[PDB]
Amino acid sequence: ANTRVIELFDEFTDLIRDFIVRHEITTPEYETIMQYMISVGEAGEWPLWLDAFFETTVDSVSYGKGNWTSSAIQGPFFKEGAPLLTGKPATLPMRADEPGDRMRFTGSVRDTSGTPITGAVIDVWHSTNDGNYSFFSPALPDQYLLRGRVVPAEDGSIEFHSIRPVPYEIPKAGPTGQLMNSYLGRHSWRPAHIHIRITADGYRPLITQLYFEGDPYLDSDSCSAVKSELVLPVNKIDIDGETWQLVDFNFILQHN
Amino acid sequence: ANTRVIELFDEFTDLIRDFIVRHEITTPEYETIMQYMISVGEAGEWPLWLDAFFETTVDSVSYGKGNWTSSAIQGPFFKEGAPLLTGKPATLPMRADEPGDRMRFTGSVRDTSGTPITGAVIDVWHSTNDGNYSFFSPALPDQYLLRGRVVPAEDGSIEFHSIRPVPYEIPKAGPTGQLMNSYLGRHSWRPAHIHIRITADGYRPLITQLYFEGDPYLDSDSCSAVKSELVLPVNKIDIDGETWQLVDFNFILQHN
Ligand SMILES: [Cl-]
Ligand SMILES: [Cl-]
Ligand SMILES: [Cl-]
Ligand SMILES: [Cl-]
Ligand SMILES: [Fe+3]
Ligand SMILES: [Fe+3]
């Protein structure tokens, strides 16, 4: 027996039941829903699906709100064990010829007093110029491409080089995409983003995302995860024929 | 996209989000729910699971409540194409020496004005003395055992013979049984029942179940589908050594 489950489950079932009566959900609709749940499972989309609609709320309960950096969902594409980068400067692992503009990120990690948090490790992950994540696409190796950890200098500053991630489309043809495009008449795009996770002894993990100014999807994120402070100004420069996009961000972590 | 589907989804979504805040669902709890949903599907238990918890409510919306016969859930074990029985009287297909007490069911199919519904077909199915349903158990062949269609006499009366169903246990070991037995600390038993489906041109389908007086789970159906109108008095008598259980019911259909 588990009392937590009993408490919650009965109120959950009561609420869905009232929901079924109040919205007149009939036999054929029910079977549609049922078959839809089955197909989400068959496509392995539950993490994708649940993250898209409910994970922002779970984050809220967990991280609260305040002076520190805002959360954004982890999503389903994180992978533990990303390699530590200590090169100067640190570059995420990528293919020779890795497509996209080049990107340089600088920033810092401090608490709310502005003391540097030397004990932090920062995970980074993002998709290819083509909208795929390593480990999650048949078109990419199951290797740590575009994934890495960096540690702050003792003054708290950090830096990593990579490629510029682009807007990402949840597949139109899977059940998650079919809900977003067809049944809801919306779309299934997210704006371009860099995923960040920062942990440190004495501190609450920060899991967040960084977005880019002028992204067409900033106001219609299909996972509803954009916050204004997380949208980054871009300074575009040329070097040797290659465009570099320079972005910067100061992370503040929450005590505990 | 259909306006109501959209407003239904957005509202469902708000229900869940409020639920998550109001009860403070944590990240690990969220992950537990996620992997459990993944389980139900991998076990092929969505029909079993949703039927257990929500199909009664869906039924109440769809069929309603009046002076016609009460609905009860279809559940996951129905099978199309059962044979027409026309013997004297109709006997459901069963093995030689099929275990359990012999059962004789009698009754009628009428409209609400008392007139017999000659165009009706009644499907019947129920489990064996061992709690097995044919086509859903490796302990039985994939043949129409304890499943059949009967047709009323011109005066609306009906009769078939079978064996007496007994309490049915949802498997303990599966995700549905785990939530029921282990996490909720209850049981996964249903009381003994006979499944009935009646269709007739110009009438709405009746899906219902018949239960038996004195069953120990009439007050604790793991699927919440017992209604006192559908609990049948049993007249038990001996005939040439064998116990017969006699049960009777007058079905009433609503017009289209
Ligand atoms: Cl992992
Ligand atoms: Cl700690
Ligand atoms: Cl603080
Ligand atoms: Cl008709
Ligand atoms: Fe992402
Ligand atoms: Fe049954």
Which pairs from A203-207 meet CB under 8 Å and 24+ separation? Answer: A203/A111, A203/A117, A203/A120, A203/A253, A203/A254, A203/A255, A203/A256, A204/A63, A204/A253, A204/A254, A204/A255, A204/A256, A206/A63, A206/A68, A206/A69, A206/A71, A206/A251, A206/A253, A206/A254, A207/A59, A207/A71, A207/A72, A207/A73, A207/A74
Dump the DSSP string for A216-229: TTTTS-TT----GG
In this structure, the number of other CB atoms found within 10 A of the CB of residue B132 comes to 15
List the domains of chain B with CATH numbers.
1-256 (2.60.130.10)
Query: Given an 8 Å threshold on Cβ–Cβ distance, is B58 in contact with A30?
Result: yes
Which of B84, B90, B58 lies closest to B162, judged by CA?
B90
> Which residue numbers in chain A precede an interruption (C–N > 2.5 Å)?
none
Distance CA A77, CA A134 (A): 9
CA distances, A140 to each of A95, A131, A134, A136 (Å)? 10, 11, 6, 8
Would you call B183 and A58 a contact, using CB atoms and an 8 Å cutoff? no
Q: Give every CB contact of residue A70 below 8 A, 6+ residues apart in sequence.
A: A208, A227, A229, A230
- Residue B192 CA to residue B210 CA, distance in Å, equals 8
- Are B213 and B232 spatial neighbours (Cβ–Cβ below 8 Å)? yes
Contacts of A3 (CB under 8 A, 6+ apart): none
Entry field: residues in chain A:
256
Residue B184 host element (H or E): none
Among A15, A47, A55, beta carbon nearest to B19? A15
**Cβ contact B222:B242 at 8 Å:** no
- Cα(A247)–Cα(A233) distance, integer angstroms: 6
Beta-carbon contacts of residue B183 (< 8 Å; ≥ 6 apart): A1, A2, A5, A6, A9
Q: How far apart are CA A29 and CA A181, in angstroms?
A: 19
Three-state helix/strand/coil letters over A184-201: CCCCCEECCCEEEEEECC
Find the length of chain B.
256
Structure tokens at A25: 């959900």
**Separation in Å, CA of B100 to nearest CA in chain A:** 34
Q: Are B157 and B108 in contact (CB under 8 A)?
A: yes
DSSP class of residue B104 equals E
Strands of chain A, DSSP E: 102-110, 121-125, 147-150, 157-163, 168-169, 189-190, 194-199, 206-212, 231-232, 235-239, 242-252
Rounded to 5°, the CA angle A57-A184-A8 comes to 35
Nearest to B93 by CA among B23, B28, B161, B180: B161
Distance CA A36, CA A54 (A): 18
Dist CA B197 CA B123 (whole Å): 5
CA of A231 to the centre of ligand 5 (A): 15
Q: How far is A234 from chain B (nearest CA, A)?
A: 33
CB A139 within 8 A of CB A208: no
Q: How far is B103 from chain A (nearest CA, A)?
A: 32
Residue B109 exposed, middle or buried by CB count within 10 Å (0-12, 13-18, 19+): buried
- Per DSSP, the three-state class of B115 is coil
Amino acid at A164: R
Flag if B42 and A38 touch (Cβ within 8 Å): no
B224 in Cβ contact with B173 (< 8 Å): no
Interface of B with A in 165-184 (CB under 8 A): 179, 182-184
What gap in Å lies between CA A234 and CA B150, rounded to an integer? Answer: 75
Q: How far apart are CA B45 and CA B195, in angstroms?
A: 20
For B251, the 3-state DSSP assignment is strand
Q: How far is CA A203 from CA A63, A75, A110, A206, B99, in A?
A: 11, 21, 11, 9, 66
Reported resolution, Å: 2.3
* Cα A47 from Cα A52, distance rounded (Å): 8
Ligand found nearest the CA of A201: 2
CB atoms under 10 Å from CB of B45, counted, come to 20
